[PDB]
Nucleic acid binder design. Structure first.
Ligand SMILES: [Zn+2]
Length: 252
DNA sequence: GGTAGACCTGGA
DNA sequence: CAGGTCTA
């Protein structure tokens, strides 16, 4: 899921779990658990803790318990559901948090690609994977100034810059491509080649793109099809080791 | 400073 | 491959 989707998950999941106390934690694919290293320690520590909050950082969900925070990343196909312990688990369910009221928080992921880290709450923010995470794209902490500072100091393409989690939190392939189209900037442009005007425009479109979604695509996945703004066929190449979609007329 | 190995599997 | 974010 994308940042706006994760924000939706955060908003909807919270009332379904807040105030519930963990009685058990069941793990069917240990590799999802990244900290503590031992999935049995991960399970043991959460037992007895009550869910107090749910926050989001980039595409990470941060479950706040009594003493610990649980940091979760769904990647592209991970999903959470709250349901009765009395009903059969859905396919590809890898982690289940059982509450004292007979309900469960279930983590499902066909790709088995998601990750979970648990730390003492006061430590979460200075440990992986949240450590070094850039500012929220919708926050004043993410400004044209910050973006310009990173752009000038690098020799990478502008797309690689925006894909860097330390520059800005949770900006993935789709929104990078969409934002660059809307900014009129070729993805393969060196970041340092961007004028001050291009940086300002890019920041504005980044915020608008992500901001509108949290509340139709121009280029992503539309290769071979006419540009919605000029009718030129959208093209697809590889930039920063990724599938990259752009209009060779609208973007320069 | 980077780029790239690692993780996973359904469908090209 | 298609995805993202970590560790090497
Ligand atoms: Zn166009």
């Amino acid at each position: 899921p994308q940042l706006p989707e994760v924000e939706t998950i955060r908003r909807t999941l919270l009332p379904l779990i807040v105030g519930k106390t963990i009685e058990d934690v069941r793990i069917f694919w240990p590799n999802i658990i990244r900290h503590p290293r031992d999935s049995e320690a991960f399970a043991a520590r959460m037992i007895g803790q009550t869910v107090r909050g749910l926050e989001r950082r980039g595409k990470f969900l941060k479950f706040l318990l009594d003493r610990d925070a649980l940091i979760s990343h769904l990647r592209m196909e991970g999903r959470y559901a709250v349901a009765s312990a009395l009903e059969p688990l859905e396919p590809h369910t890898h982690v289940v948090f059982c509450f004292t009221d007979g309900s469960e928080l279930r983590y499902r992921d066909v790709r088995k690609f998601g990750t979970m880290h648990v730390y003492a709450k006061e430590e979460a923010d200075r440990r992986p994977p949240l450590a070094e995470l850039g500012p929220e794209p919708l926050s004043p902490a993410f400004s044209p100034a910050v973006l310009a500072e990173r752009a000038v100091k690098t020799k990478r393409s502008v797309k690689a810059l925006l894909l860097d989690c330390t520059v800005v939190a949770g900006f993935g392939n789709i929104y990078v491509d969409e934002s660059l189209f809307r900014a009129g900037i070729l993805p393969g442009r060196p970041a340092a080649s961007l004028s001050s005007k291009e940086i300002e425009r890019l920041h504005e479109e980044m915020v608008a793109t992500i901001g509108e979604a949290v509340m139709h695509l121009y280029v992503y996945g539309r290769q071979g099809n006419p540009c919605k703004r000029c009718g030129t066929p959208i093209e697809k190449t590889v930039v920063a080791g990724r599938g990259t979609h752009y209009c060779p007329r609208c973007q320069r």
